[PDB]
C-alpha cells in the first residue's frame, strides 16, 4: 500500500482514510479528514493554519 499526503495539512493518509476531491481543472486534492477538507472548502490558507506542515515549514517549526 501507498501512503498519500493531505493536500492541506501535509498529514499522512492511510488507505481508506479521508476523502479525495477532483477540482474542475482536474487537480487532485487529498484530505485526511473532514477538518482539513472543511478548511480547504472554506478556502483557508494552510500557510496560515498553525498546525499544518506548510505553516510549520514557513515558520521554521521543528527546524
Amino acid at each position: 500500500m501507498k501512503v498519500e499526503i493531505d493536500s492541506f495539512s501535509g498529514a499522512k493518509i492511510y488507505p481508506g482514510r479521508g476523502t479525495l476531491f477532483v477540482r474542475g481543472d482536474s487537480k487532485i486534492f487529498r484530505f485526511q479528514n473532514s477538518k482539513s477538507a472543511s478548511l480547504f472548502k472554506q478556502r483557508k490558507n494552510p500557510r496560515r493554519i498553525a498546525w499544518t506542515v506548510l505553516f510549520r515549514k514557513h515558520h521554521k517549526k521543528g527546524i
Binding site: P15, T19, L20, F21, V22, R23, G24, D25, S26
Partner: protein, 129 residues
C-alpha cells in the same frame, strides 16, 4: 461491468454537459438499468447511461429525449481501494443508445469507471479521474 457507485443524480437532476455538442446542461428523466421500488426516484451514478433532455443549449438539441452518460458525479462514492472521492460538479455527455458520443471532446476530468465502461467516452476523454 462496474461495481456499485453511490447514486447522486436522481431523476430531475441537472448536470453540466461536458461535451462540445452545443448543450450546456442535461436534465435527467430516466436511468438505464434502474430497478423499481415504490416512491423511489431512479438515480444515476458515474458511468451510468441516463435518458436526458437539454434544458439550455443550441435549440436543435433541446425539446427531445436523448441518451447521456454521466462522466462526473460530485456525490462521494467509495472505490474498492477504499478511496472516497467526488468531483467538483455533476457532468455528462450526450450519446446514442449504443454509447457513442454525439460530441467529439470532453472538457474537464472523467471518472475512471465511466471511461472503462464506455470506450468512446474514454477515447474522447482527456484526464481520467
Amino acid at each position: 461491468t462496474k461495481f456499485r457507485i453511490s447514486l447522486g443524480l436522481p431523476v430531475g437532476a441537472i448536470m453540466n454537459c461536458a461535451d462540445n455538442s452545443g448543450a450546456r446542461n442535461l436534465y435527467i428523466i430516466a436511468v438505464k438499468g434502474s430497478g423499481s421500488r415504490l416512491n423511489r426516484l431512479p438515480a444515476a451514478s458515474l458511468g451510468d447511461m441516463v435518458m436526458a433532455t437539454v434544458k439550455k443549449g443550441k435549440p436543435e438539441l433541446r425539446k427531445k429525449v436523448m441518451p447521456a452518460i454521466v462522466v462526473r458525479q460530485a456525490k462521494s462514492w467509495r472505490r474498492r481501494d477504499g478511496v472516497f472521492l467526488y468531483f467538483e460538479d455533476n457532468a455528462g455527455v450526450i450519446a446514442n443508445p449504443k454509447g457513442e458520443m454525439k460530441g467529439s471532446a470532453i472538457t474537464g476530468p472523467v471518472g475512471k469507471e465511466c471511461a472503462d465502461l464506455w470506450p468512446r467516452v474514454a477515447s474522447n476523454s482527456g484526464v481520467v479521474v
